[PDB]
């Protein structure tokens, strides 16, 4: 359940008040399901040695990749959950750069400042590594924009706020052919909810079948996963979009 605040006003004497009943809303999160499958022949299972463990490792790698990419950008439509960037796109959370097709120092300050001060205090950064390196390259004379020095790791704090890393966001606004590139994101992350239902489970199918419903000499491996996520308040973020002359 979400809602808003009562709307007061300055009224003169002997004045009838206004109806100030706030409105209510109900954010809801559907729970989706992921799947995978690896069929195997009998001879392969008997001859090739130590295959079950390798298949388990491959299943884990695939699950982690899918889960990370979907959390970053999930279309929300169809069978997919909603990623943060997809949810924020088009909404008033979007910002335009000061100069078109350019990433300058002032853009960081803009993304940090246009956000409401109630949320600014407990927000966090999230972007790709390319963008962080672009930020680190800003300073030349050792002035205010001196985040850290070459010969050192990646800093743990920006503007006194935590920093995060995500590969699956856009990196280059010129190489790609997409018109818009969401490169930087800052906001209060308590407004992104993840619903966890059950972890990865692997089941062993002893016998598969053919067209005529008689065995064809193969076995399987079934794995599935359930999860769901969305955004309850999209005004708590200030995603930045460098839209290019597409």
């Amino acid at each position: 359940v979400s809602s808003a605040a009562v709307q007061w006003s300055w009224d003169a004497e002997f004045e009838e008040v206004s109806d100030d009943s706030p409105e209510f809303g109900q954010p809801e999160i559907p729970v989706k399901k992921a799947q995978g499958f690896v069929p195997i022949s009998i001879e392969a299972l008997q001859d090739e040695a130590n295959v079950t463990e390798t298949v388990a490792l491959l299943f884990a790698e695939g699950k982690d990749e899918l889960e990370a990419v979907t959390l970053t950008t999930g279309t929300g439509q169809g069978n997919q959950p909603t990623g943060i960037v997809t949810a924020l796109a088009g909404t008033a959370a979007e910002i335009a750069p000061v100069t078109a097709e350019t990433f300058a120092l002032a853009d960081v300050y803009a993304v940090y400042e246009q956000l409401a001060a109630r949320h600014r205090r407990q927000g966090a950064w999230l972007a790709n590594n390319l963008i962080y390196n672009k930020i680190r390259q800003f300073d030349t004379q050792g002035g205010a924009g001196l985040w850290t020095t070459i010969g050192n790791g990646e800093p743990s704090q920006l503007l006194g706020r935590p920093v995060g890393e995500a590969e699956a966001m856009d990196a280059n606004w010129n190489t790609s052919a997409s018109a818009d590139n969401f490169v930087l994101l800052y906001g209060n992350f308590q407004n992104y909810v993840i619903a966890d239902r059950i972890g990865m489970t692997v089941e062993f199918i002893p016998h598969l079948f053919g067209t005529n419903r008689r065995p064809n000499g193969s076995r399987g491996w079934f794995a599935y996963y359930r999860m769901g996520a969305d955004v309850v308040n999209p005004n708590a973020f200030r995603l930045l979009n460098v839209e290019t002359a597409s």
Binding site: V1, S21, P22, E23, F24, G25, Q26
Partner: protein, 47 residues
């Protein structure tokens, strides 16, 4: 601000009785009480 969902109606809990209500007539018969019951050990019973 009343019971419409958009006006605070989303705030009221949800009541439900978990038990199911069977809406089938069924049928009452007493043959098994009177009939003679023999265990069959195969396909056909001969007398």
């Amino acid at each position: 601000m009343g019971l419409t969902k958009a006006d605070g109606g989303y705030l009221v809990p949800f009541q439900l009785d978990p038990t199911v209500i069977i809406t089938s007539n069924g049928s009452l018969n007493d043959i098994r009480r009177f009939a003679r019951q023999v265990v069959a050990t195969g396909d056909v019973w001969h007398g």
